[PDB]
Amino acid sequence: TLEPSTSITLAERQQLAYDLSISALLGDKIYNFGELLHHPIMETIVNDSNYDWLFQLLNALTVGDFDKFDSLIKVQISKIPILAQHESFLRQKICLMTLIETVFVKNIRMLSFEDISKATHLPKDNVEHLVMRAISLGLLKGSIDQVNELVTISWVQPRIISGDQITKMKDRLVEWNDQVEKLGKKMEAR
Amino acid sequence: QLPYLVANVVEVVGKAAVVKTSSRQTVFLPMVGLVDPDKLKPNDL
Amino acid sequence: NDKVRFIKDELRLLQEPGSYVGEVIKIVSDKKVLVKVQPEGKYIVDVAKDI
Amino acid sequence: DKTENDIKALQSIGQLIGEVMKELSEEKYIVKASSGPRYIVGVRNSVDRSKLKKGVRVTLDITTLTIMRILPRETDPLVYNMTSFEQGEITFDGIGGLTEQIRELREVIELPLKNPEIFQRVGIKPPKGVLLYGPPGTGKTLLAKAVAATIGANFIFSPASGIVDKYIGESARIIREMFAYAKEHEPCIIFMDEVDAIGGRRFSEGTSADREIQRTLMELLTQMDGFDNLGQTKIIMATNRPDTLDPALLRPGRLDRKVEIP
Amino acid sequence: KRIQSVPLVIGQFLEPIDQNTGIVSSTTGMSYVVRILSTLDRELLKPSMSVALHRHSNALVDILPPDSDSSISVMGENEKPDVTYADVGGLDMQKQEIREAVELPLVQADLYEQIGIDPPRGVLLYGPPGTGKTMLVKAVANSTKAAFIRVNGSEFVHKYLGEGPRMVRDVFRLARENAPSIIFIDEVDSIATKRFDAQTGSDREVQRILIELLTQMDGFDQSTNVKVIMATNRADTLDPALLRPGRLDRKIEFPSL
Amino acid sequence: ILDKIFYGVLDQGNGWLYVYETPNQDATYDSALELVGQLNKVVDQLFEKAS
Amino acid sequence: HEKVTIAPLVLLSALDHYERTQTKENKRCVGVILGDANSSTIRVTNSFALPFEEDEKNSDVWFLDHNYIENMNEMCKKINAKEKLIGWYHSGPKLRASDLKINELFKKYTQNNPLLLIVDVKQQGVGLPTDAYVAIEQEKTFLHLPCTIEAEEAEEIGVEHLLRIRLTNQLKSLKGLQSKLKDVVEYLDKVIHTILGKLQDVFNLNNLQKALTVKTNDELMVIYISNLVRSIIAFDDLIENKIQNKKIQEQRVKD
Amino acid sequence: TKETVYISSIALLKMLKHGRAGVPMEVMGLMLGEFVDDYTVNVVDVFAMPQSGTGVSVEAVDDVFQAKMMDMLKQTGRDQMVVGWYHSHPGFGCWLSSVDVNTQKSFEQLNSRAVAVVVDPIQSVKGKVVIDAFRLIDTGALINNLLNKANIQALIHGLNRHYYSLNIDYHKTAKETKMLMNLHYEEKEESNLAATKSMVKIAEQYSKRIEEEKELTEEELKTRPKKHLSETADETLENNIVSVLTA
């Protein structure tokens, strides 16, 4: 709203930005903080030292280590219990979204339990609970078929990513066009 | 235009009346500001 | 070819405004006939040239 | 603007009324027009396709000849063969000193109308018919008007002689239509005054012109005893003295309640 | 196909004159000589039909089945019963009597054939209605999966010479097409009372109905795909003609003790 | 189970009661069986005439 | 959501307007559509042309007469009251900067929020050729509303006097895939993400059909059998007629 | 006598639409176009005039209305003369009213010649369209195509009456016609949707065709029918075949 109109000064910007960072960290939705950093605040107001926390977070999800965000971040942020629970929801969300898009390029939506556990950097039984919890939220749709050690996955994950997506998308469109033509030739002929 | 066919009335929802014309036909028609629903009855022209 | 034609003959034949059933009251020698038509009036009408 | 809205309302075109004779299909219907001969007419758009029944009044297009609307069933005026008194002239505790008769009309008639559920739940029948007997104006008329007020029923006075048309099935038509209207406009009291111009025990129940009377009574008896029933249609008989009524009417399943007015 | 389309007028077929000519009556009160279907012939086509005619191309579009319902000279139809026997208790004897009279010839043709009898076309019930007596009748209609056709026998009692006596024939015809069916006659004893004396009009009709039923019953060889149930409350106001057997064989009593 | 009230079977070897599925054919045996009968009358007849 | 019924008359008048004015591709014919937009289903039942002169060299400069809309609406209304103003049409076929201004104007004296019907003058789509668009603002919002085509019983009958499979389907599928790819490449080219996401989802939700196809092959086997029997019934009839002919022929020659 | 009066598609469409809602009260409007030599009347456009609630009349024509529409038409670039008039008139299609004859006589003197187009909307729903075109009086083919000259010799001696039933044709332009046929997303959706819904329902349809066959086969046996069996075998077969073909 702010950027075409909305008169502000750096005070009001700082207050608004500080609150934006805090809600984002504690939150778990609105994708990861890769999105937040991409929207403009870091070059309108100060870059680090309350704004260290976005970059640090991003790195803590990626390695897997809960201790690394906690040690780096300050008392105001660290204190909240909500954040650490929501860290797991975020870590699973990036690895699962990325992987899901990748694995087929025909739309076959399927992750094993093992594949997710490897990906997130977490033991099997812990991920078995996170995915169940996630279905519990409706952050994931599908169900987990406990026996055969395959996750049957249905859609609810929104995507907006690029740098994997574009590449995969051209291949899929090409592969179709070829498939269609061959069939189309044969029928046209007879 | 004079003349007009007369009618009797057998339904007086909010804008509807049914009139029975002296041509033995019943029609479903709407009402206007030149009728009152108080002059829509049997034994009136 | 015949089949095409058969269907067509039906399509023409079935288009009609209907003809009235009536009764000859009596025969007239100027080649008119008097018919009292069942649902219509009474008319004196011109017999067919070929009847 | 009112005059300009008026001209708009006038440019509209008539639209012929019929009755559905029977529904032939889900997209073909047989109609006896109330404007013409016999017709096959069809569905339009977004029409009620399972509610068109024998003798319901319907709206049909002038040229399109498809179902434009459904109206409630009507085949007889509602305004002179049926004279309507919405509520009652007086309440049911302002005529007080008829209190015993007030008391036992109140619990037979009011309670199944208001609460059909208690009679369904027990599994017994709701009451059928109620009889007022004694001279008229002993406060007879009061008690009949007064039970209707409290329910907020319509009181509907039917003159029994007028139920005596001399045409085929007119007589059938009139009774049925009151019963049909009683269910549409529910709750309602159908008050039938004198049951010796359409019922009674006659001269000996032979034929002298006592078959018109016999046709009328037969109709009353067939609906009551049969598959049809009285639930939110209450029928109330009135008679100078009760001994004058056919013993079929004196059976339960026609008249279960029989109140005296001393 | 595209031309032969709803909406159509209904009129009635009198007779086919020859092939592609039939005479029709439009229900306007105008009659026409028209061409007929070339989908049907004379072996696919019966003479008396309700028919569909084109409105402006006045010709045989389609055939309908015969129809009899109208708002003049009314008849009661009740389709899909909902009553099943032993509504009232102590009709043990009576439940068995009706069962072998009415229910049995319709479901099993075959037992009448082998004994070498022909099935009774009529049953008489005497007693009060609406005690337990009506309830059983309605129960048979349900069990046989038959249309219940309620006739108030004083309803023609129409005051015209014309429409009603004609209708009654048509009702029974419509019943045979949609076999099985119950023609259930309220107070047949009303119209078992007839003129004996000069009374002119307004007493003439009860003779017409009585005679109509009589012509049919005695005039035709026995069958039962349609049962006639007579219901009676005055047992002396009958006429002997009715009561004669070879047609009306069953006399079922409703018990009063 | 043998009367086929309930659609189960017994696995006696196992000593357990095991599942069965109630619908084991569609209406194509009936349908064809009727057709075979008609066709066979018509054909048989026709061959005789041809001679 | 709203949905559009467009009468043939609108489209054929639009056609006539384009041709008689020798409209180019630096000009677009502009007119008025009329009907009823009273209901949530918008019925377009008539239309009429407007004097309009366009300059697409300088987008701002165009010449359109309002007064002609107003004077004609009163005359239109006097004949029937269902010829009320619901919108406008232009050819388009693409959206321009001079589209932006005209969208503003019609908002003011249309009682409803006008329908902008884009009438394609070459028929470049495939099946159908007409797209309905709507302007409304908070960000300029243009959203394709579905169309469908209907006419009166007498018109429909009229249409047909004037005028008097598997491949085409494969072909719509082939064209679509091609075009969508073309749009995706260009979209990327301009860029160097949200849209890519939107497309990606549609995709994600022969491959799929695959497993279920197996029991459709059982269903098809049954139909093979029915059909076998139907050819055989015709063959039976062919035999009868051939016997009859044969015998009759022998008799003719003999006599 | 003989004239091919050429009706534009748009004129036709707008006349049938208007005329069907406009009845039972008569409706009229003006036909626009050109005369080209003789043997040819081209009608280019048609516009409505107002309704009147008891039927349009010669007393109801209004020259200011007809005028204000043409002047506004002109600045699109629609420049035509009046070539005639249309009227609804139920139960007219081969006959004319005495009012309508007199009405035509005033109109054709203003123009060079003029058609009275009478459209009937009742038998326009019966799988046919009824329209006729008349012109009694004038020179244009009553002297090129017309005992011998019998109509116009008697015509001029007066105390005569003949309708002047004309010939009529249609066409507008090719481009409109390609567009009209492109009315019938589209063909693909439609075809898939039908395909799925066929597979669901084949369960009833199987059984029902067995009865049709069975009935036919029984009939034949008694007889020997064959014609019905052929029709009835073709219809079922063609329709399988499309259901199979889709998949």
UniProtKB/Swiss-Prot annotation, chain A:
Protein family per UniProt: Belongs to the proteasome subunit S11 family.
Protein name: 26S proteasome regulatory subunit RPN9
Entire-sequence positions represented here: 198 to 387 of 393
Note in the entry: Present with 12400 molecules/cell in log phase SD medium.
Domain PCI: 1-158
Superkingdom of the source species: Eukaryota
Function: Acts as a regulatory subunit of the 26S proteasome which is involved in the ATP-dependent degradation of ubiquitinated proteins.
Protein species of origin: Saccharomyces cerevisiae (strain ATCC 204508 / S288c) (Baker's yeast)
Curated annotation (Swiss-Prot), chain B:
Places the protein is found: Cytoplasm; Nucleus
Recorded superkingdom: Eukaryota
Mod. after translation: N-acetylated by NAT1.
UniProt record similarity statement: Belongs to the AAA ATPase family.
Role summary: The 26S proteasome is involved in the ATP-dependent degradation of ubiquitinated proteins. The regulatory (or ATPase) complex confers ATP dependency and substrate specificity to the 26S complex.
Protein name as annotated: 26S proteasome regulatory subunit 6A
Originating gene: RPT5
Span covered, complete protein: 74 to 145 of 434
UniProtKB/Swiss-Prot annotation, chain F:
Domain of life: Eukaryota
PTM statement from Swiss-Prot or TrEMBL: N-acetylated by NAT1.
Coiled-coil regions listed in the entry: none
UniProt record similarity statement: Belongs to the proteasome subunit S9 family.
Function according to Swiss-Prot or TrEMBL: Component of the lid subcomplex of the 26S proteasome, a multiprotein complex involved in the ATP-dependent degradation of ubiquitinated proteins. In the complex, RPN6 is required for proteasome assembly.
Other facts: Present with 16800 molecules/cell in log phase SD medium.
Complex and partners: Component of the lid subcomplex of the 19S proteasome regulatory particle complex (also named PA700 complex). The 26S proteasome consists of a 20S proteasome core and two 19S regulatory subunits.
Protein name: 26S proteasome regulatory subunit RPN6
Annotated source species: Saccharomyces cerevisiae (strain ATCC 204508 / S288c)
Species lineage: Eukaryota, Fungi, Dikarya, Ascomycota, Saccharomycotina
Shown residues within the full chain: 381 to 431 of 434
UniProtKB/Swiss-Prot annotation, chain H:
Motif annotated as JAMM motif, chain positions: 87-100
Residues annotated for Zn(2+) binding in this entry: H87, H89, D100
UniProt-listed InterPro entries: JAMM/MPN+_dom (IPR000555), JAMM_MPN+_peptidase_M67A (IPR050242), MPN (IPR037518), RPN11_C (IPR056263)
SMART domains: JAB_MPN (SM00232)
Keywords: Acetylation, Hydrolase, Metal-binding, Metalloprotease, Protease, Proteasome, Thiol protease, Ubl conjugation pathway, Zinc
Annotated ranges, domain MPN: 5-140
GO MF term (any one): metal ion binding
GO cellular component, one term: cytosol
Recorded catalytic activity of this chain's protein: Thiol-dependent hydrolysis of ester, thioester, amide, peptide and isopeptide bonds formed by the C-terminal Gly of ubiquitin (a 76-residue protein attached to proteins as an intracellular targeting signal)
Coiled-coil parts of chain: none
One record GO biological process: proteasome storage granule assembly
Assigned EC number: 3.4.19.12
Gene3D superfamilies xrefs: Cytidine Deaminase, domain 2
Free-text note regarding domains: The JAMM motif is required for the deubiquitination and degradation of ubiquitinated substrates.
Subunit structure: Component of the lid subcomplex of the 19S proteasome regulatory particle complex (also named PA700 complex). The 26S proteasome consists of a 20S proteasome core and two 19S regulatory subunits. Interacts directly with RPN8 and STS1.
Family stated for the protein in its record: Belongs to the peptidase M67A family.
Function text: Component of the lid subcomplex of the 26S proteasome, a multiprotein complex involved in the ATP-dependent degradation of ubiquitinated proteins. RPN11 is the only catalytically active member of the lid and serves as the essential deubiquitinase of the proteasome.
Protein name: Ubiquitin carboxyl-terminal hydrolase RPN11
